[PDB]
Structures are given as structure tokens and as C-alpha cells.
Amino acid sequence: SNADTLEGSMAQLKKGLESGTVLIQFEQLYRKKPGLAITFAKLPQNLDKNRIKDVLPYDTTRVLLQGNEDYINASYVNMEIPAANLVNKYIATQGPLPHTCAQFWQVVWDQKLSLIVMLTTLTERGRTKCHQYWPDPPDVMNHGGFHIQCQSEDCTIAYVSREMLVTNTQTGEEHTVTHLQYVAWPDHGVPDDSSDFLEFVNYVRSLRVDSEPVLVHCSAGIGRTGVLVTMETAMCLTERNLPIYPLDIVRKMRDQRAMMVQTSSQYKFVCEAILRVYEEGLV
Numbered sequence: 001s002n003a004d005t006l007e008g009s010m011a012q013l014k015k016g017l018e019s020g021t022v023l024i025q026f027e028q029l030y031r032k033k034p035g036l037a038i039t040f041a042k043l044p045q046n047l048d049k050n051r052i053k054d055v056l057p058y059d060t061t062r063v064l065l066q067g068n069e070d071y072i073n074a075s076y077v078n079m080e081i082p083a084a085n086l087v088n089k090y091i092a093t094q095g096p097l098p099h100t101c102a103q104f105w106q107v108v109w110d111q112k113l114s115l116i117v118m119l120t121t122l123t124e125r126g127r128t129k130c131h132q133y134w135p136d137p138p139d140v141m142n143h144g145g146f147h148i149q150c151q152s153e154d155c156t157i158a159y160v161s162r163e164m165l166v167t168n169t170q171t172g173e174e175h176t177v178t179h180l181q182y183v184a185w186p187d188h189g190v191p192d193d194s195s196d197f198l199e200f201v202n203y204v205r206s207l208r209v210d211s212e213p214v215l216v217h218c219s220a221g222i223g224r225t226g227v228l229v230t231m232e233t234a235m236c237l238t239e240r241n242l243p244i245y246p247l248d249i250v251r252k253m254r255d256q257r258a259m260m261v262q263t264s265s266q267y268k269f270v271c272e273a274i275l276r277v278y279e280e281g282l283v
């Protein structure tokens with residue numbers, strides 16, 4: 001709460017969106033933190049595990065797999081609210097490729113993650129965005145020694161909710177995951193409907209479990225993923241009457257996974273949404 005009140009930070013944000021200063025400061029923020037090594041992601045055996053050749057995890061915050069081939073394009077992203085004894089944990093990752101679905105489910109299993117948030121359709125205007133790593137009901141899939149079954153599938157206008165049963169085939173052990181797929185948010189763009197987006201972020205927040213990471217991905221794992229992380233962080237701050245500086249939220253994300261929030265229009269969108277949530281909270 002140190003630099004301003006919440007009220008003051010919102011007046012600053014509103015004034016700066018109108019004047020242009022908020023986007024000028026965004027444009028000057030580094031997209032990749034200089035000084036953080038990126039080496040494992042570039043190793044010859046890992047190149048085909050990256051959906052986009054230059055969207056890569058930092059060494060220090062990459063998610064490790066157990067075994068001989070430890071690599072997945074995934075990053076730990078933890079958002080602190082220090083004035084509240086609160087850290088919101090995420091794993092930010094890409095949409096799996098046909099041959100990385102086994103590693104994707106390995107992360108879910110190893111960490112017993114109960115919530116996956118997918119922010120892309122499988123394809124867009126003829127371009128592949130994500131491999132379908134879950135079965136249609138009532139098919140089954142096997143990925144890397146995990147048997148996957150869809151127990152329910154409930155569509156809404158903006159998103160699909162699926163309950164997935166993950167079974168370790170070698171031991172019979174079972175784990176249930178809630179899978180949320182937001183289908184109304186195009187790549188490098190903003191949500192088709194701002195109200196649907198905010199309801200969805202609410203819903204995600206309601207499913208978060210204490211001290212367990214939420215796995216979030218789009219196609220590359222940085223743009224729409226970064227907007228969601230920024231929004232959830234801001235909602236936590238406004239409810240606690242703590243000041244919100246979106247530029248610092250984005251910087252804190254980018255120190256953990258490069259390039260989060262890809263476009264200036266995405267940033268403008270999330271800043272406007274933050275002002276809306278704030279104003280609604282005053283009511």
C-alpha cells in the first residue's frame with residue numbers, strides 16, 4: 001500500500017490511459033529479463049518440444065520433469081501480494097504438441113494439479129494452436145503412462161468445463177482435474193466479451209486451491225496467459241484495498257516467463273478491465 005492508496009492508483013491508471021502515459025510505459029518495459037539464462041530450451045534434443053522457436057522458458061524458473069529428458073516448455077510464475085501473506089502460484093505453459101502431451105500430463109500428475117485453464121481453441125483460421133490432449137467423451141487416451149478419461153463436458157457461450165479422471169496405469173492411482181477451456185478469445189487479441197471474461201476469471205479464482213499452482217496455457221503460453229494472470233492479481237489487490245500498478249505486475253510476471261502479455265492492445269484491455277472491477281467493487 002506503500003506508494004499510493006488503491007483509490008489513488010486507480011485515478012492514476014485512468015488518467016494515464018487517457019493521456020497515453022500508461023501505454024508509453026508499457027512500450028518501454030523489457031519483454032525478456034536480461035540476465036536470465038535460457039540454455040536448456042535450446043538444446044538439440046529439446047528444440048522439437050517448443051511450439052514457437054523463440055518462446056522459451058528461463059533456466060531458473062522452468063518446470064523440471066523427472067527422468068532422463070527433464071524438459072517441458074513450462075514456467076513457474078508466482079504472484080506475491082506481500083501485504084497479505086499471499087502468493088498465487090501458476091505454471092504457465094504452451095499448448096502441448098502431439099509428442100509433448102505425455103510430458104504435460106506428467107507435470108499434472110507429479111504436482112497433483114487440480115485445475116487446468118486453457119485459453120485457446122485447438123485451431124484458428126486454419127492454424128494449429130494446441131493438440132487435443134484430452135479425449136472426447138466417452139473415448140479414452142493414454143499419454144506417457146497415464147490413462148485420461150473425460151467424466152463430464154459442459155459448454156457455455158464463452159468456455160467449456162470438463163472433469164477429467166487421470167489414472168496412473170502402473171499403480172491404479174486416480175487423480176481428478178477440472179479443465180476449463182476459454183474458446184472466445186482469439187490469439188494475439190482480447191476476449192470477445194469483457195463481461196464473459198471477468199465471470200470466467202471469478203470462476204477460476206473460485207476453483208483455486210491454497211498453495212497449489214493453477215496450470216494456465218494458451219498456444220504459446222504468454223499472451224492470453226499473461227492477461228489472465230494480471231487480472232487475477234488485480235482482483236486480489238482491489239478486494240484487499242491495495243494499490244494496483246499493472247506495469248509492475250507485468251514486470252513481475254516477465255521476470256518468471258518472458259513476454260507475458262504480448263500486445264499493447266492486450267495491456268490496454270486488462271488495464272480497462274481493472275478499472276471496471278474496481279468501480280464495481282465500490283458498489
Ligand code: VO4
Nearest residue numbers: 219220222223224
Ligand atoms: O497462445 V498465447 O499467443 O495468447 O501466448
